[PDB]
Enzyme design. Structure first.
Site, mmCIF file in Angstrom:
data_model
loop_
_atom_site.group_PDB
_atom_site.id
_atom_site.type_symbol
_atom_site.label_atom_id
_atom_site.label_comp_id
_atom_site.label_asym_id
_atom_site.label_seq_id
_atom_site.Cartn_x
_atom_site.Cartn_y
_atom_site.Cartn_z
ATOM 1 N N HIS A 67 65.639 10.184 -65.588
ATOM 2 C CA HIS A 67 66.701 10.069 -64.597
ATOM 3 C C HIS A 67 66.133 9.940 -63.193
ATOM 4 C CE1 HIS A 67 69.143 12.362 -61.585
ATOM 5 N NE2 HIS A 67 69.982 11.389 -61.884
ATOM 6 N N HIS A 115 63.566 15.162 -56.232
ATOM 7 C CA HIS A 115 64.683 16.111 -56.300
ATOM 8 C C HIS A 115 64.559 16.815 -57.633
ATOM 9 C CE1 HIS A 115 66.021 12.384 -58.120
ATOM 10 N NE2 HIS A 115 67.137 12.857 -58.573
ATOM 11 N N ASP A 116 65.455 17.719 -57.858
ATOM 12 C CA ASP A 116 65.544 18.350 -59.175
ATOM 13 C C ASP A 116 64.238 19.035 -59.566
ATOM 14 O OD1 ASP A 116 68.168 17.573 -59.425
ATOM 15 O OD2 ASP A 116 67.892 16.293 -61.187
ATOM 16 N N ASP A 266 71.041 9.080 -55.960
ATOM 17 C CA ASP A 266 71.170 10.084 -57.006
ATOM 18 C C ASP A 266 72.546 9.986 -57.649
ATOM 19 O OD1 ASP A 266 70.860 12.722 -58.396
ATOM 20 O OD2 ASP A 266 72.230 13.393 -56.806
ATOM 21 N N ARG A 430 50.638 44.058 -69.760
ATOM 22 C CA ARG A 430 50.655 42.832 -70.530
ATOM 23 C C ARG A 430 51.772 41.905 -70.081
ATOM 24 N NH1 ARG A 430 48.164 46.833 -72.703
ATOM 25 N NH2 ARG A 430 46.570 46.405 -74.292
HETATM 26 N N1 LIG Z 1 76.287 19.481 -69.755
HETATM 27 C C1 LIG Z 1 76.652 19.450 -68.489
HETATM 28 N N2 LIG Z 1 76.096 18.527 -67.725
HETATM 29 C C2 LIG Z 1 76.357 18.382 -66.443
HETATM 30 C C3 LIG Z 1 77.286 19.327 -65.931
HETATM 31 N N3 LIG Z 1 77.419 19.038 -64.677
HETATM 32 C C4 LIG Z 1 76.652 17.998 -64.426
HETATM 33 N N4 LIG Z 1 76.015 17.564 -65.471
HETATM 34 C C5 LIG Z 1 75.027 16.455 -65.414
HETATM 35 C C6 LIG Z 1 75.412 15.162 -64.776
HETATM 36 C C7 LIG Z 1 74.402 14.934 -63.701
HETATM 37 O O1 LIG Z 1 73.223 14.414 -64.227
HETATM 38 C C8 LIG Z 1 74.039 16.282 -63.224
HETATM 39 C C9 LIG Z 1 75.174 16.751 -62.346
HETATM 40 O O2 LIG Z 1 74.993 17.821 -61.432
HETATM 41 P P1 LIG Z 1 74.027 17.706 -60.227
HETATM 42 O O3 LIG Z 1 73.947 19.099 -59.842
HETATM 43 O O4 LIG Z 1 72.856 16.985 -60.769
HETATM 44 O O5 LIG Z 1 74.783 16.911 -59.075
HETATM 45 P P2 LIG Z 1 74.796 17.210 -57.485
HETATM 46 O O6 LIG Z 1 74.025 16.162 -56.774
HETATM 47 O O7 LIG Z 1 76.207 17.308 -56.958
HETATM 48 O O8 LIG Z 1 73.992 18.612 -57.327
HETATM 49 P P3 LIG Z 1 72.864 18.969 -56.242
HETATM 50 O O9 LIG Z 1 73.517 18.684 -54.959
HETATM 51 O O10 LIG Z 1 71.725 18.115 -56.671
HETATM 52 O O11 LIG Z 1 72.549 20.405 -56.342
HETATM 53 O O12 LIG Z 1 74.057 16.897 -64.478
HETATM 54 C C10 LIG Z 1 77.850 20.314 -66.832
HETATM 55 O O13 LIG Z 1 78.647 21.151 -66.467
HETATM 56 N N5 LIG Z 1 77.504 20.318 -68.061
HETATM 57 MN MN LIG Z 2 69.825 14.429 -59.656
#
Ligand SMILES: Nc1nc2c(ncn2[C@H]2C[C@H](O)[C@@H](COP(=O)(O)OP(=O)(O)OP(=O)(O)O)O2)c(=O)[nH]1
Ligand SMILES: [Mn+2]
Ligand SMILES: Nc1nc2c(ncn2[C@H]2C[C@H](O)[C@@H](COP(=O)(O)OP(=O)(O)OP(=O)(O)O)O2)c(=O)[nH]1
Ligand SMILES: [Mn+2]
Lengths: 492, 503
Positions: A67, A115-116, A266, A430
């Site tokens: 990604h 990021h991430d 993103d 440990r």
């Molecule tokens: N399984 C699951 N996947 C999710 C959920 N929310 C988001 N996703 C997936 C879709 C995207 O790849 C990413 C969405 O959240 P992000 O935190 O990556 O987006 P955002 O840019 O708003 O967050 P950030 O500002 O980076 O902290 O993960 C969820 O609740 N459950």
């Molecule tokens: Mn991202």
């Protein structure tokens, strides 16, 4: 005045390059950043951290790495179109960009890949497990006020003395910092304090997506209600974030101007790529999807999705997404590129309180469409929902496993630090050894720099002790955390 | 014959290509569109699960095929940037046509760097092994080397050398070798074109042909292209596609595309070095233990020399006086940097030095072959790795399991290669056949994309032809080789276990 020579800083925190430098010399400085990021194990560790589907066992589904790499190509397209579109106006030489064309691009690409990088093992459920586990121990809700009076906090030194002190302000900051872990804030701690990647100040500012301090207790400000959505840095880096607030000409709570390009790249790539994975994980059909979109809105739907839907039908599935990508890319990358140039003054100051995609524009209407289809028909799937539930227990069990190290007294713990093996604490000995050395050196370095006599010293030692533990967990794979949990519960 | 890169750095495609003028900004866009296809291709995501030296490494900190191919991507960048920059200063650039093709020059390497290994089979050179061995036991090409005759150990029928010509025994002779010579690279060419269909720009598709030998080559090579033809670079299934590709790029037969030499270099350099970084991570030995293996592996070192500038240099830098992960993580990005600063330009020069034989495509060497004290450095790793890294018993063991997994997987699907043409053709048309319950269900497993290539290629045949049966079989074993080779270490492992009823 928009002068990008004053923002694209090519100096480092350590062994900095100094003075003059060619247009080609300033390039090789940023080309050194590429080699430092690409060869980094923290970027390799992403092919095992999860994005949307936890522990997906078929490589055709995206991880955090695949990604992040696709974000990297979207940010390249956006940066290259801002340079081309701003070249239609020649404002580049007017903005200082005439000789910083490459660094403009490269910083985006690299800070797209990074990021991430600080996200914990299980996405928003690593974050959850950690903050919840720390709230139950050191309730930040009680230290909000004064006094006083029945303080529900299990840490002794961090309980508010009734008893007023201005050292009760340190207590307040620490309790809220440790309960507000965030991938973005942990990302800054990662590249500086823990990895020590050196890097240019510009590249380090390109990964600062949020400007709220973790310890922030007051839910204010309006001018910056968006850039202070989530925390972007910890109490442990207040000093480093200050040196960067200087080095990049950033105001307090102000963002770096190139961060807005990545944030757009993103959002743009995860919306479509998640629906591509869903059809591959066979959650629904290319047709099933199309109707979900239609029931969710001549318009833009016809321009982008309907357009690709009829093109796809006589791999109709390959076929479907190759175009949906292109159509969305052809219409949303320029909207972002221009929306950047349009709001460039507030974006250069880093005060622009909105995201590069406007809830008004039909272009943003397309993005929220993709995100709402996924929220209802992908993130709600039950196999996703329980792997989400499992990860919360894994991380919460890991924390309780290591809790006895947070239970020791300052003297006993410090003893354990110096004496690698302590006789009366075999278990804590440990457990301490399992902590990665990198994470351990960071605790030592930071506590060494403290005033041994200070009445606040015991409070800072515990903060950096809890931060050392959070560093261990978060710097884990989805999979390494699951194995460690099972190994240490004696079920494997 | 003048070095003109307008004649190589093409902007055309084989399918739905654009024609007409095209600004310099238009030519960048056209190669940046390729970028979006390679990165967004599932064939490349599939690498974060493919083997790189360590099979099924369970900690991401060790390299996969993706992370290695990603780091090679950056080494080709740092070389094109040092090849062209040195060229713009002397003389030149504009005398070679590169004044307007600077971005495409970089992008072609960078992208076709990510795409080596793309055609590599699940278990590395043991996928290659398992496949050629399993097909040799069936179609012994050793017998069809000459003529006759006389007792053909060939298990097929429509493929035995008969007899009594038939000058069509040459087709038989060709196929009997092509299928027994599957190659990660040659399969890469088939992959980007025939199976994945990205329609990439002829320049980009020339950057991945690391070799010029055709799989069906039954000869003992030449003497001029005696290097560029070590391994196969393409299959008989693409003989025609390589003709049109050899034209569009004005390449003579068996001549390489000029940017490929850059790619070998980015490859050569990123693995040998990165492999030793991993070995230390896997606690096979320590950064210290490693050193001894190097100066005890070196020769004619005497005093001041290259070893000192690069590894000695990093040895003292490591033992304190800087760290930030404590000497080892330190030792490695110096050793990385030192090796890089003192080797990328050397290679760069070798390109500019022989750029005529390297551009006409005939230079029978790679930009790191000569006994220069610089090739001496590469062989150092390389030879250190082969002795103390690739020889570890846990690595050697998972290689053995992979050979069995891929070999059994071929035997599991062997029943589809046994059916008769009419029997197989029927199963193709009616997806479900009643008297072939087992063969039908095995067929449904063969992911479509691979199947469409069989239909597509066979439909285009002369059904009346006396060749048709032999082309039907070639395209049949290719369909099987396509399924297996396009698998992850892990998917191939699970399939063998799911279908052996052990899990
Ligand atoms: N399984 C699951 N996947 C999710 C959920 N929310 C988001 N996703 C997936 C879709 C995207 O790849 C990413 C969405 O959240 P992000 O935190 O990556 O987006 P955002 O840019 O708003 O967050 P950030 O500002 O980076 O902290 O993960 C969820 O609740 N459950
Ligand atoms: Mn991202
Ligand atoms: N585990 C193991 N790994 C090996 C062995 N031989 C080579 N490798 C690994 C180490 C290097 O990453 C890489 C070397 O071969 P490559 O396939 O990358 O070879 P080469 O540079 O000849 O180019 P090519 O792949 O022929 O395109 O594979 C072996 O016997 N065992
Ligand atoms: Mn390679």
């Amino acid at each position: 005045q928009i002068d990008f020579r004053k923002k694209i800083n090519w100096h480092r925190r350590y062994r900095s390059p100094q003075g003059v430098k060619t247009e080609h010399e300033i390039l090789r400085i940023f080309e050194s950043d590429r080699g430092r990021i690409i060869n980094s194990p923290a970027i390799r560790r992403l092919q095992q951290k999860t994005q949307v589907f936890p522990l997906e066992r078929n490589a055709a589904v995206r991880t955090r790495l695949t990604h992040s790499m696709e974000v990297q190509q979207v940010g390249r397209y956006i940066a290259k179109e801002i340079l081309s579109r701003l070249k239609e106006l020649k404002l580049l030489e007017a903005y200082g960009l005439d000789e910083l064309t490459g660094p403009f691009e490269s910083i985006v690409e690299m800070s797209c890949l990074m990021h991430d990088i600080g996200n914990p093992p299980f996405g928003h459920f690593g974050e959850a497990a950690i903050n919840d586990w720390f709230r139950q121990r050191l309730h930040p809700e009680d230290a909000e006020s004064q006094p006083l009076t029945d303080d529900r906090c299990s840490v002794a030194a961090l309980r508010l003395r009734d008893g007023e002190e201005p050292l009760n302000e340190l207590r307040r900051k620490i309790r809220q910092d440790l309960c507000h872990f965030e991938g973005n804030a942990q990302g800054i701690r990662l590249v500086h304090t823990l990895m020590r990647m050196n890097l240019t100040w510009a590249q380090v500012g390109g990964i600062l997506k949020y400007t709220r301090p973790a310890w922030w207790r007051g839910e204010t400000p309006e001018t910056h209600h968006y850039l202070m959505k989530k925390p972007g840095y910890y109490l442990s880096e207040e000093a480093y974030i200050a040196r960067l607030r200087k080095e990049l000409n950033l105001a307090l709570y102000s963002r770096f101007p190139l961060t807005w390009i990545m944030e757009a790249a993103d959002d743009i790539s995860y919306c479509v790529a998640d629906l591509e994975d869903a059809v591959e994980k066979r959650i629904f059909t290319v047709e099933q999807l199309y109707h979900h979109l239609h029931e969710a809105w001549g318009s833009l739907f016809s321009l982008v999705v309907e357009n690709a839907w009829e093109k796809s039908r006589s791999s109709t599935e390959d076929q479907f997404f190759m175009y949906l990508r292109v159509n969305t890319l052809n219409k949303l990358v320029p909207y972002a590129a221009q929306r950047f140039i349009d709001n460039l003054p507030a974006i250069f100051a880093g005060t622009f309180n909105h995201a590069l995609l406007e809830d008004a524009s039909e272009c943003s209407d397309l993005l929220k469409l993709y995100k709402n289809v996924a929220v209802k028909h992908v993130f709600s799937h039950p196999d996703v929902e329980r792997l989400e539930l499992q990860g919360y227990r894994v991380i919460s069990g890991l924390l309780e496993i290591y809790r006895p190290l947070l239970s020791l007294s300052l003297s006993d713990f410090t003893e354990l630090v110096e004496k690698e093996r302590v006789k009366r604490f075999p278990i804590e000995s440990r457990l301490f050894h399992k902590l990665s050395t990198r994470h351990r050196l960071a605790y030592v370095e930071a506590v060494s720099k403290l005033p041994s006599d200070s009445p606040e010293f015991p409070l800072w030692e515990y903060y950096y002790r809890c931060r050392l533990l959070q560093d261990y967990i978060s710097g884990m794979t989805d999979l390494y955390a699951w194995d460690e949990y099972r190994r240490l519960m004696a079920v494997e």
